[PDB]
Design a protein around this ligand. Structure first.
Ligand SMILES: CC(C)c1cc(Oc2c(Cl)cc(-n3nc(N)c(=O)[nH]c3=O)cc2Cl)n[nH]c1=O
Length: 247
């Protein structure tokens, strides 16, 4: 099947089973990702440049952000086949990974701004000084890189699923079963990329490297959260934002 075709040099497009999964993951992403470019309103220059005034803007939108990731996971059926313990662990893990990817693809190089949530358009300094620190620099840096891949909404969606189904997080019972799901995404992704016919050499390896970069953004963010908990008062943290990134 897969590895013999690879030996021949055929780049196989998706199967009828995979197209059904591709449609599901894409429609899940599209529901949970709201005409972004005109819809944005820019956060002002005096906000930023931890700035608590800047922190306050993000924490309003962060409760929506977190639920958008949970509702995406909800819309995937394989996720629903897992237990609550594993589901909670998986969300707690990939939440900021999925959040960051989405912010990175909404990067405009003329204005030099990621557009958070498809509404709050911010600069590298604003997101940095408002809370994220060096995690701002990484998401911007990613956005700059992801601009020249030109990922469609399917490619972002399948990429998000890969991050969700990550068997290596601690406390997971069904580790074997999560690997099977990730593999079926990863294989379908590889196949969709062949249907797309991108004209960047070694595209698929290069795109897998961005999965690792996203996994770094999440880990660095876990450390930023600890600094945020020290620097900012707990009154300004929403209960869910605490719940998702604590412990
Ligand atoms: C400063 C602190 C409060 C903080 C800010 C922060 O910034 C972001 C926010 Cl509030 C949202 C998203 N985001 N999330 C989604 N679900 C989505 O569809 N689109 C999207 O842009 C992305 C980023 Cl980077 N991330 N984590 C943090 O801990």
């Amino acid at each position: 099947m897969e590895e013999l075709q690879k030996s021949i040099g055929h780049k196989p497009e998706p199967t009828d089973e995979e197209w059904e999964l591709i449609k599901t993951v894409t429609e899940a992403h599209v529901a949970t990702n709201a005409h972004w470019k005109q819809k944005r309103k820019f956060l002002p220059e005096d906000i930023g440049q931890v700035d608590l005034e800047a922190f306050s803007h993000f924490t309003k939108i962060i409760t929506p952000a977190i639920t958008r990731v949970v509702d995406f996971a909800k819309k995937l059926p394989m996720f629903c086949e897992l237990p609550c313990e594993d589901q909670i662990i998986l969300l707690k893990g990939c939440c900021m990974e999925i959040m960051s990817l989405r912010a990175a693809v909404r990067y405009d190089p003329e204005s030099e701004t990621l557009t958070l949530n498809g509404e709050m358009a911010v600069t590298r300094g604003q997101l940095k000084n408002g809370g994220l620190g060096v995690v701002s620099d990484a998401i911007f840096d990613l956005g700059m890189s992801l601009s020249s891949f030109n990922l469609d909404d399917t490619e972002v969606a399948l990429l998000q699923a890969v991050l969700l189904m990550s068997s290596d997080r601690p406390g997971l019972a069904c580790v074997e079963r999560i690997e099977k799901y990730q593999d079926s995404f990863l294989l379908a992704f590889e196949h969709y990329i062949n249907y797309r016919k991108h004209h960047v050499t070694h595209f698929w390896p290069k795109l897998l490297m961005k999965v690792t970069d996203l996994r770094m953004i999440g880990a660095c963010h876990a450390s930023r959260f600890l600094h945020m908990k020290v620097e900012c008062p707990t009154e300004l943290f929403p209960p869910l934002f605490l719940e998702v990134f604590e412990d």
